[PDB]
Design a protein around this ligand. Structure first.
Ligand SMILES: Cc1cc2nc3c(=O)[nH]c(=O)nc-3n(C[C@H](O)[C@H](O)[C@H](O)COP(=O)(O)O)c2cc1C
Ligand SMILES: Cc1cc2nc3c(=O)[nH]c(=O)nc-3n(C[C@H](O)[C@H](O)[C@H](O)COP(=O)(O)O)c2cc1C
Lengths: 216, 216
């Protein structure tokens, strides 16, 4: 039951460094990242999937200073995903999305493709020109991806922990993201928790529905 | 199989106005909204769940002008969820979160609670005082909730569609969110698609892994 997964998954505070994702699981988590929905299917993202020791160690460099409490999670997990958002929405990217959809057979007529292009351009320009907030708009799509991902890995029986406790500037520099047109937002170590994960047995806590929900 | 769900779920284009969520399903989608994770368990959100014709009509007021193409989805769906983010992170809310966590048994000592409170305050001030972007920080947590929600309802066998194509100013005014300290970000109609929901048979389309993923 997906609801049971929701009530059972937790933020892993300690991973068993000897437990690696299987080849099939490694392929599956990439599928999750790739198929997350997004506004106008803009997929304004890039993902770094570190599974080698040096790769994870390079990501771990961002858990410096006060963020050191997140270093072990990045080092011990099997696969560490760095969720990145594009820094600017370029026409090239927008054309790539519609051309991919065309190549994937989503348009039965030329009019169908044009309508799709028209709609994406409307949203893209509203953010790039009118509101001048495409950077924030894209980052929002990436967090949506993170949300999709966390529930997904949980449903796969894998453990993970979403991390904002890292120096993005350091991480960006380490992987030359700036030059590539991206910036790091969330780091997500994925693997299996050890019996040492104190958060694995603590009850989950959320504010009451009477407070967060309004029915009408 | 969550991966099959990710490869099958889709943005519903039309809902069967006669098919409603069962009472149990209605409780489950609220559980999904409530239990989504968030930075420091800040839960900087509020949800409007419209299930009555009068309620859906109020939300549909936001599908005006350019957004009229989204009106039908908001009116025909069984339940319409409006995802809202806090406009500013106040100490009162942070207090609520830590007190609830204590009530839920997450702390073994008073010192443990104080430490958790200090840490959350640190992160909150980093956004409130330093970066002056707590509004964007909280909105990101909401989108993550949306991402969790869409995969969740998909795994429930339910149909839904995320909507950014609505006038938030109109929606905010209609529900007096401003005064309550919230602002609408995404509208998500939930229910069962109709025979005419063409997007149900069209193949999904995403850019290739060779473009979006970097393995290290
Ligand atoms: C965007 C985001 C950033 C987070 N940052 C950290 C972090 O840096 N380190 C850590 O251990 N947990 C971090 N958390 C975990 C939260 O504290 C956690 O999701 C919340 O307390 C609810 O508990 P749960 O994930 O076990 O359901 C983060 C969560 C999200 C969703
Ligand atoms: C934040 C967000 C906003 C969206 N806005 C709309 C919308 O206003 N109307 C609509 O019909 N679809 C909307 N979409 C649907 C996208 O176009 C869709 O998720 C994407 O093309 C991928 O297709 P899929 O959801 O079927 O996998 C939105 C999606 C997200 C994630």
């Amino acid at each position: 039951d997906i609801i049971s997964v929701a009530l059972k998954r937790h933020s892993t505070k300690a991973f068993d460094a000897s437990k690696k994702l299987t080849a099939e699981e490694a392929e599956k988590i990439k599928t999750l990242l790739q198929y997350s929905p997004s506004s106008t299917n803009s997929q304004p993202w890039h993902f770094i999937v570190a599974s080698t020791e040096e790769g994870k160690a390079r990501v771990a460099k961002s858990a410096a200073g006060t963020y050191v409490f997140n270093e072990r999670k990045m080092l011990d997990a099997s696969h560490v995903v760095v969720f990145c958002a594009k820094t600017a929405m370029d026409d090239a990217w927008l054309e790539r999305v519609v051309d991919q959809e065309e190549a994937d057979g989503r348009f039965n007529t030329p009019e169908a493709k044009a309508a799709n292009h028209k709609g994406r351009t409307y949203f893209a320009d509203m953010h790039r020109v009118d509101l001048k907030d495409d950077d924030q708009w894209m980052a929002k799509q990436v967090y949506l991806n993170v949300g999709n991902f966390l529930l997904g890995v949980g449903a796969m029986g894998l453990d993970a922990v979403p991390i904002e406790g890292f120096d993005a500037a350091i991480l960006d520099e380490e992987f030359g993201l700036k030059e590539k047109g991206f910036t790091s937002l969330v780091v997500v170590p994925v693997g299996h928790h050890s019996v040492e994960d104190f958060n694995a047995t603590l009850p989950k806590s959320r504010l009451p529905l009477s407070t967060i929900v309004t029915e009408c």
